[PDB]
């Protein structure tokens, strides 16, 4: 005389559909969790890294030189180069970078180029040990964005001779066989350098990203494509979309031959032919009501290829104006799920190989047994996997995300809540005798059980029930109600996997 209902692998958070209409395998609310392989796990933790450099860092770029990883960190006035042990200044002089003049950089013909909208572009050759101004660069010209494509360098949103114009794409000469382009003059008809203007809408060019064999250019309200054809015209221009654009720089990533883009009022995915929205009907209303009005330009997107995730980082309304991004929504493109996570007031992030330089030994191990840990064979350095590093400009810190299970020592709280469960019977009263969780790992969780009499109305909650992961089989309670609601609250100092549960109910108890 005891009924049982089993919920298996509930993943994802949906706030657009009313909780009474969601399938049994979805969460109505959550915080500080990840969904992967049908399991809900604790969100990743951050640890300090590069704790030997001075001045705040704006942007970061990883690369490999001389078979050694190297992170180029652009500051407000000087560059630095880091290898995990030492930080070396390589800046030529004093730059005028700021939060309104961000850095673009890349590689071209073996030369590493960097640029900001308030200085002439700088280059670094394999022979030199420092940056030098870019040769042949025209005087009194600044480029908001600078990128490399095939055998060309491209400038976007260009100011020249104190008059600015954001709807011109400028490409230099091919200049093959290594080296830097020898000229940028478009007026010369004996070379292949040229200019074009995408001026048919009031929007302005924001960013440009490669995709397969094309260069996608994102305006504020439209999306164009550039293709290289050679001949007498070199480049061919084609308009792709006219109804959506991009929110800001670093808001478009490439994965599996598609582009994930965060636009104005929508988040979509396109392959250059077909476009479809991925945030609709899941977290759309929640997301486009939490953006801080005074800071809707620090939003940026990062990618985790190993975990197959896309992070959208932004500044929520919980923070005062003037602060940087503090919240993030993570989308899993292999399972189509969303998650919400807190951030430690970061401004930019990067994905690349890093060596923390931490010895293993036996007598150099803080963080006692029940703190994440990894498999026995794995060490602190894994060259086969990348890692994510964020930079907090205002707090002047660099965080490496990953192994650690604490917010740099501090403990955080993870929550998962579902409400309005009635199992197809919205008249009788349910009893709910026990809850059997399926959690593997270490730590202690708290379970809250509540009931509601009218759909969408207030909920009467019952006191927290402790549950020891790995020892306790179930928690005992007695909660008569019409619509059931469950809340799982996980503390820190432990790693846990959560992949469903079971509700054990006594026979019904009337209909009023």
């Amino acid at each position: 005389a005891l009924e049982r209902q089993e919920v298996k692998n509930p993943t994802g958070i949906v706030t657009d559909i009313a909780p009474a209409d969601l399938p049994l395998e979805k969460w109505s609310f959550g915080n500080n969790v990840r969904f992967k392989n049908g399991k809900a796990q604790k969100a990743l933790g951050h640890t300090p890294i590069f704790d030997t450099a001075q001045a705040p860092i704006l942007d970061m770029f990883p690369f490999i030189r001389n078979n050694i990883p190297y992170w180029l960190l652009c500051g407000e006035q000087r560059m630095y180069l880091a290898d995990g042990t030492t930080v070396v200044d390589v800046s030529p002089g004093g730059h005028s970078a700021s939060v309104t003049s961000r850095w673009s950089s890349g590689s071209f013909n073996g030369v590493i180029f960097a640029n900001n909208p308030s200085n002439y572009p700088y280059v670094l050759m394999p022979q030199n040990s420092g940056f030098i101004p870019m040769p042949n660069w025209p005087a009194n010209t600044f480029a908001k964005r600078m990128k490399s494509f095939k055998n060309f360098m491209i400038a976007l949103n260009v100011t020249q001779n104190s008059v600015e114009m954001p709807q011109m794409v400028w490409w230099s000469t091919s200049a093959d066989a290594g080296g830097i382009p020898v000229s940028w003059d478009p007026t010369d008809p004996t070379k292949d350098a040229g200019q074009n203007t995408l001026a048919d809408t009031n929007g302005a060019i924001v960013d440009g990203v490669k995709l397969r064999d094309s260069f996608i250019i994102y305006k504020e309200d439209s999306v164009y494509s550039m293709r290289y054809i050679g001949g007498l015209f070199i480049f061919q221009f084609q308009q792709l979309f006219n109804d959506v654009g991009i929110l800001g720089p670093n808001c478009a990533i490439e994965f599996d031959g598609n582009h994930f883009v965060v636009g104005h009022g929508d988040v979509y995915v396109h392959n250059g032919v077909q476009k479809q929205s991925v945030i609709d009907a899941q977290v759309r209303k929640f997301f486009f009501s939490d953006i801080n009005p005074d800071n809707y330009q620090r939003t940026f997107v990062i990618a985790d290829h190993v975990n197959t995730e896309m992070w959208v980082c932004y500044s929520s309304t919980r923070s005062e104006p003037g602060k940087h991004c503090d919240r993030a929504i993570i989308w899993n493109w292999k399972e189509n799920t969303w998650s919400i996570r807190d951030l430690p007031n970061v401004l930019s992030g990067a994905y690349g190989i890093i060596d923390p330089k931490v010895s293993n030994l036996w007598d150099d191990d803080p963080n006692p047994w029940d703190t994440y840990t990894s498999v026995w064979g794995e060490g602190s350095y894994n060259p086969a996997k990348s890692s994510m590093i964020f930079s907090s400009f205002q707090d002047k810190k660099l965080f490496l995300f990953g192994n650690n299970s604490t917010f740099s020592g501090q403990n955080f709280v993870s929550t998962l809540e579902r409400s309005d469960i009635y199992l197809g019977d919205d008249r009788m009263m349910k009893t709910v005798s026990a809850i059997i969780p399926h959690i593997t790992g270490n730590g202690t969780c708290n379970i809250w059980v509540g009931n509601a009499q009218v759909q969408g109305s207030g909920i009467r909650w019952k006191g927290p029930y402790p549950y020891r992961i790995g020892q306790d089989y179930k928690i005992d309670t007695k909660h008569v109600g019409r619509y059931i609601a469950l809340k799982f609250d996980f503390s820190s100092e432990g790693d846990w996997y959560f992949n469903g549960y079971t509700i054990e109910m006594a026979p019904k108890a009337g209909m009023r």
Binding site: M429, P507, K508, A509, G510, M511, R512
Partner: protein
């Protein structure tokens, strides 16, 4: 409220507890539990009455056969 305590409550609280539970389940319009608790209350009342009746065995015979003619 004006009469918090009575001899019946202090002598056998199960009677009042079961009666209140049966009334509650009648109010919430549940049928099986209401019948169950009603049977429990009836059994408790019968037990109390039986204990009272067998208090003195000698008096049981009397007060039964009176005036036949």
């Amino acid at each position: 409220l004006a009469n918090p305590t009575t001899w019946a409550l202090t002598k056998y609280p199960q009677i009042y507890l079961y009666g209140v539970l049966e009334q509650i389940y009648l109010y919430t319009m549940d049928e099986a539990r209401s019948q169950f608790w009603g049977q429990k209350l009836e059994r408790a009342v019968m037990e109390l009455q039986n204990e009272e009746n067998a208090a003195d065995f000698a008096s049981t015979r009397l007060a039964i056969k009176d005036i036949e003619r």
